[model samples]
Target: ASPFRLASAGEISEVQGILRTAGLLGPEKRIAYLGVLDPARGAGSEAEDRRFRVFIHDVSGARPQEVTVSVTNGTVISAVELDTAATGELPVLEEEFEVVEQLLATDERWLKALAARNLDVSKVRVAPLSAGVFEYAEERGRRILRGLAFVQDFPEDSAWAHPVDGLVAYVDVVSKEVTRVIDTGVFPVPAEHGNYTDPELTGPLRTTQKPISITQPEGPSFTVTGGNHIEWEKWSLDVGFDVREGVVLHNIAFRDGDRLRPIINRASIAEMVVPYGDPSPIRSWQNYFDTGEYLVGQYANSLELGCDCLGDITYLSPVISDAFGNPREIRNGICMHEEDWGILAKHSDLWSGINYTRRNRRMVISFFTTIGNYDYGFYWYLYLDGTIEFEAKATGVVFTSAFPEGGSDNISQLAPGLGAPFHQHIFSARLDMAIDGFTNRVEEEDVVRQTMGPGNERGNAFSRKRTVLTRESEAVREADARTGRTWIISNPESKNRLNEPVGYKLHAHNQPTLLADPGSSIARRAAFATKDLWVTRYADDERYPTGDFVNQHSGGAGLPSYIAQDRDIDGQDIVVWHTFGLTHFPRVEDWPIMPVDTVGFKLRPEGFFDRSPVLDVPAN
Candidate 1:
């Protein structure tokens, strides 16, 4: 309940007028989340909750700097000031100042000692020089100060033999200027051996075990009727793995039925590959299981037939571009038509859902690591509802991927106008939905209807959507920033009036300029990654666990981490993708396998939930 009335459309415009005066929004007006009503819960609530945070984010700089305004009175919140030329913490020279002054006053030989350190003896007159810091970058000057020691007429606190010999110098490097120096004496680093991993760490899983299951039972208390809604809490796990070599094996098992007639099934594994320049005559690489699915059970002669969704249009006829300007299957001529794209697409979309029924309640073994030569694995789990949660674990170290390096990683699709070559490495997730022909809503819409029951029978015709990448683009356009506007558009009440923000004006035709920083993007740190996790790629060779594990490793796919604003060898910069998520694989070195990592997520009816809550009640 707002202490103040909902700002009318005209009042909203008046606020916009204020912003327009400041040049943030456009004269035409655009809408975005602004703030939450103060005292969000009650009129006398604390400031934190009642406090609504508003922002105008469409401006420039490698990262988006928010222009936040407070809601109570719609005052300017805070404008992020990017300090590109800031240095590290200032040094402590108070003692040194005293030392130098005393030495000059008393000792003549002090001049000789100072001269030995390469400082001009005659010009060595001391002053109350304020402490300062230094900064360095790949493209700019590399400033440094070293060998700090002072000779002065001060009290002998620690003794005349204090460690501050003439050889001591305050060393500052421009590499990273923090508020304080990283005292080497206090934080002594162990000797480096080039090997970053601690050898004492345990090895990977030895004895293989079936995937664990922990689905919430469908109690009579909770009927499977139509048109109602029920959901599990967010079940998630934090895990790690030690992947060394051969084809890794794992799956998520889901069960929907009760003790007697239980149904078991599995999702198709996505063909994970680390495609590299073809040793073959062509330099092109290919994809095998783009949908990320594979069979879980063993076949007749030990061969396997995946519980797959065949006839999937994506797998049957997906068109992908190659190094050359040719269109082909995801794997091009490689896997050909034998693989199921339908399963891959479906398996990838397993995040935060209830995998019900014979087929839906099945396990999924997503293949990974084909392109590069390294070890790799992902972390995932089955939720209380038996839904599989497979996410990229980690990726091999990254190399250059740009113009001179040449290939998908580095090749510029900017010229081809291909809209930023869509690769598997970027942080992305694939979710697939199939709709009904007439009603057009999802085929599973009935499942929701059953929960809600009959009454409001309005049906949605937008089901059966193929697939879409939900995250916004990393790139920004000119229109994205309202800088060019002559005046800010009048601010309007935000969509969620319960929690909306005060508005600002736009700068007509205003343009955003790139940040002056010469390295990685500050935005990488500031921007939200949408999903908590990301994807990583790896070749069989680069993984921590090598040998037989390498032989079986799949190519690469989604990971928990990704490259962003990192530096390259030549001191240039690049982004390396690394996957960090829940991993259930316990190394053989781990001996008696540890408890299963409990991890999973719940997806309640959002855009997909049915409106009529009581449409198709089940047989009671």
Candidate 2:
């Protein structure tokens, strides 16, 4: 009943009908993205006006177009072509990747480069990368991708173990040619088999883990309430899937008697950047906008993999367009389940010798994206005690390069000649907060000590300094663990019993932001990663952190310019852009498969509740 749900097959057919009517679709045209368009701002979008936006990429023209259609009305809302000369590089479609591979198949230079590295072309896999914008003369206004070569000894061997280093191929899908090949230098490939899944090569499996399983005979407490809306405990939220950002939560609210009090309007991992720190000439342009450039969600594993979830798992299959504009479904695309979360509140009465405890559980909505060598898992957790959490799990084969046998460089040497570089997987989250209503204000809280003051005769007094972020510039802040810094988004109009604004405290960690120099192109492309948090007055079009078209274009377009007016944000309907994720300095511990390097932030009730809201929950 709303735009927040996954776009259905019926909606898709109607969208295609609208596109065909407009003469925008054909045999060569591909729908890079097909998702619900954000509803128009102001008054009554709570549960209607279902509009779908389609990113049409015509292979013949190499021109990107965005057209919005209304399935209910069977009419086109808007249609516009992105700037072909500047912007308009849509997400790399599956066929584009295939075509790029096909372009490199017969290319003499790339094949000779492989032969020069003593590699068999049959056992090698081609990796087509999003050609980052470097302002080169040859890559101007062309659909280009940088192709890398990898080899395997056998059919089941690790494809990434051996690297055909220093040779890079630039393939243009439009021209159907390998435009350029850069071979800096050749190096020996790692000889060791990096296969952890095979017990024959890896020796034997450990016997310590034993047999373990989780079960819920009574079934899960969470219910899929019509479409993707989730109703679990006091939490009520809509689940959304995007072709770019994967999972997004919308209209998150907590049940208060008969009312469903709103907390957040929308929240999603808007964009992410993985910038390698190795400054070698061969990989200087190795920065990747995973979501913006590669389109992470499109590559999500058919999450139907067993052992991924436990206890009454419900899967929602999201619909999208395949390369040829055919309707495709990622079976078991979004997974939702319940898991025990230890204890909510527990204590023992010393005098009475009685223990009082309440076991709590959380609802988990998760999706996994395998973008090349990196596999990232995005999880949204809702606890029983009115708290929301987003945790990112990075677990995959690390991107590697072949180094000299006895030499060491800026990268961490995993094996004899395998080098894993330093990189940052910085993620940007767009949080549209509605603590109690749309009129909200953001305040930074820092714990400060009163130094030998009159207020504290024994010099033990300390208090929190609350700084109301009044403007956009003033709201750009950082995480300070030293000061126990936290940001609060509160409804100024809604006061609690203590006359405090109803709010939730945004908990952040002290992870570093963008490590690149400000002048670097990557840093500019991902300016939103420069700060821990950025608050801006709400605007519907201001969605992605790195702007709409991040494919080989100039930077500083998204959050950097979203708040260009520096408008007053306090007591305004504002959106908060948060930067958080892993900064990997790899080692031998992360060799074959990196253990899940998890990083996350929490949103807990500060004054949103008058007292413990979960006190009435079942006590065991």
Candidate 3:
């Protein structure tokens, strides 16, 4: 039985009907269906097939109870209710959109702000605010939601160009009322003409672009089995979605001759933190843990056929549950496609002057998630050379924080009143290595320039050093551009024909570490960004780098807490956490929409194969 198949629409409706008859449906009662997740190994039984869990929460009742109903084959098997205080998992819901809408429709201040600008109330667009990390001094014990206002023009497709500048609204989630309003009273000029609706603005701007198409001639060579399971030549993996993590790849393996070799047990974006540089009350405290707070997978944008992807892409639909536990499918949430890489390797015969070039091909699986004002696209690449690459591209409107010219050095004026604050977008991923087997070792290899007498008597000489990390304590490392450091995951028991341990090298590209002061709230909440590489012994319970719940969290969770145990990791099951960051200093060019900013990491095989794995690639 495949674990990736979600409950059918019939099954979901059946459960809803059963719960309604059981008197579990109400205005305040929230229902959510947990996707068919992978169960523990050997925990399977015939009765467990087509079984899933549905969560129901009663927020209005005095005794607030969170219920978990187990359903098998469209029949309710068990219902267990626990006090809401005992369990906080029910917060994994997206109900703030309606609440924000209601508040904006009725709030007097909001209407007045619109009237001042002669903007139609119905044409206003609301950017639903994701909950940010809370500061103890400001938010003592309250659930608050913040949102920004954007005035829409009938002719303009881009509402972000006309921002209701200097207005920030805070809503109390419990009462669904507007709590606070921050109005800087600075109405800057709106970029109404910056509409992307016109074909010249939104459509293809390049007039003389040549057509570049990838044709297979025969057909797509990859095989997709079990819906989500994809196999392309020597590469195979099962891709799935989590509400918190966007695209998760499981049981990744590379084919080596007759037997399939395990490379990674699982891989995912653990968490991401974007910290704005403005020190204003509202902007200073705006560091977002995108995965933990906004739930990246839930915000996955609907992908278009010809726009988001090309070349015969296979689309996958992901099932997501709402606050009331009602499951809905997000169509085209994931896309898989194959691309041509021009050349894998080329060789020239000196005497005959003959050139031979083998064409390279790669399989790419991707998805996009929009967190507030920023759109992020994640791509996972599996190449013929047995290389795996994780790439994330960010392109969206910049969040303007209010800061005067002399107030902060990091502030850049994109508009008269709007301040384009300096910010950092840091992303971290969890890589669980299972090369050949489960037990693996981590080695740090560095390239060093020789400075000493024996081998470096010549002025310019370079050397390399390999450091094997023995325990979890010594596994924490940072990326050094000066020395060129990279982490390697290898199996001590498995070696190639050259008697070298088979491994894969992991490294981040064009990334930065957090520059915030150590004691700042942003730094404390996202401690995982402080270091680039973290290796730990595998723990089933530990997953997110920013902990499970980051909404109003006061820190002391996530990677920092998980690594406090400091267990032995040498030649054992280990999980690697690598953080990639970009310090964005917004410019005028990034105003209307930012050009796609990319940050990624690559995993290259090191002595994992006897020869060039893609040597058999077809010649073009």
Candidate 4:
């Protein structure tokens, strides 16, 4: 068993005890997140020794601390306190969510806002949200949450449909006080119960589809041993789950003959910023850093059948710590299974009058996280053709506001009186490149067209143009559909049969970046989302795309700051950040509940393989 295994429950408890003994945790400080300290980057950095990466926050004082402990030796390795005053609040705890409900109950101003709408406290459902940057004086350096109210007709009903529009309570979580109430006119609460999943609401469900079951009697084609070590087809990877990132696949490699060649050293959803584009007062300030503000992985659902995943699924229960520093388990937190990926490769030969076909499958490592009204599924797929794709699934109820029954701007009508706002789920993925090894170079490729009369008297001349992203500033690029832009990461030291550096091409299905004003608060803080691709030289401390602490951050952190030095990226151990997602203009059908909306980016072999690797896919 390797020390790189996901931290066990016993290990967490012991680590917590060690921290408490060292006076790191007590009445003031709370264990915000406790995860396995990843091994450093490069060849000699493999984890023969293990350490615990800890985030401890002082709830009462709003100070955050980062700790690294050697679990192997049972000693504290290093600890650093965040330099900022209150900019970096810890990830919202489950306990903090409940705290808002209680805080609003007694606050006279908050109750007054409810009373004005003729609603009782019992009817209101408060969505305690991360108070984004640029806030009240009191919120400047305090533990804060914005209590966004939604009306729940019944305990089982969806409150999202019945928004208590434009009423927000700025509450200081530490003080247990509602700092102020921002009420911008009263709008009618949506009358729809919005519970379509219930039989009584939807009436008889469609019976068009027949029952289909996938029985892999031979069982899954993958094996997990020594805790998180996984092997599927020619792929081998180590899995780690964190309170923030959910599922992280590490030290991924593909078996080539007798050689196990490295591909990705580490990969995870570095950051996800859900920015809503509504000018309405209540929502004008809505930009959420889901993974940073909320330890998204902690809110992962206990997956089951008839939905989450279908067929011969195996689950990995990731152990995490609660706010009170007790170890807890998110059962079925990480799901593993093989999926039929349709056609791998196929062709017909006229010369031989015979058709050659290759059909194959992909191994899926996935996890689902629910952030307030939205549910997200993070999936990592490994293919037989030496392809790595990260797919994101967005479903669940949309965040809504009350609208006039007739119509209104900036609002998409979900139901009669419910308004779903325009938003984008822009997720930034950090791919720590290890193409053939760690040291790699990045280049962008685009299909270029030649002008008439220039080596083309008949016109119609085109060629492929490759640009080396030699520095950090030059590496920040956007996806261009006009030229079918693609980025390639290659190990200069490794060459294929054609002497081309072994590499993989990145594909982001041409997507939009942050739609906010370039000068807007969200635009600066989430600057990583400003472009589709960003390449930076890897630094051990540079884990997250959006600086370490995101809660109420004052902008100019992460990516912007990481590249302020503008380090050379030509041939270094680099990390590529790909931004991709949905720019949703919600349709009426998306209301009540949304069907799964998936968006992803792929890493396909360009010159990484000397030949078509899928030529030997076994016949069915």
Q: Which ten residues in a row have the lowest lDDT in candidate 3?
A: 83-92
In what order do the candidates fall by lDDT, top score first? Answer: 4, 2, 3, 1
Which should have the higher lDDT, number 1 or number 2? 2
Q: Which regions of candidate 2 deviate over 4 angstroms?
A: 42-48, 351-354
lDDT of 1: 0.23
lDDT score for residue 567 of model 3 = 86
Error of 3 at 95 (Å): 3.2
For candidate 3, the TM-score is 0.88
Candidate 1 lDDT tens digits, 1-620: 32322223333344454455566554322222232222222225444422222223221212212344544455655655322223111112223234434344334444445554444443333332222111323221222223223222233211111112212222222232212222222111111111113233334544787654333234222211111111112211111011111122211111112211111111112223222221211112221111121111100011122322221111111122111112223221111011111221122236756442211122222223322212233322233232334344333322111122233432222211111111222111211111100011111111121222254345432222211111213211122221211111111222113342111111112212212122222112111111232111222211121111111122111221122211121111111111112221222222111222322222222221123212222322
TM-score of 2: 0.96
lDDT of 3 at 199: 69
lDDT of 1 at 109: 45
- Residue-level lDDT of model 2, residues 230-316, one tens digit each, is 999988999988888899898999997678899999999999999988887667788888898878888888775456765678899
Q: What is the lDDT of residue 62 in candidate 1?
A: 26
Residue ranges of candidate 3 with Cα displaced over 4 Å: 4-27, 31-33, 41-58, 61-93, 104-124, 133-141, 153-157, 184-193, 199-206, 351-354, 401-408, 415-417, 459-461
lDDT of 3 by residue, 501-619 (tens): 89999867847799898888778778899899999888875877877556666666778887888888889989999999788988877866788988999999999999988777665
Candidate 4's TM-score reads 0.96
Off by over 4 Å in 1: 1-319, 332-390, 393-526, 529-602, 606-620
Which pairs of residues have clashing backbones in candidate 2? none
The candidate, 1 or 3, that scores higher on TM-score is: 3
lDDT of 4 at 97: 82
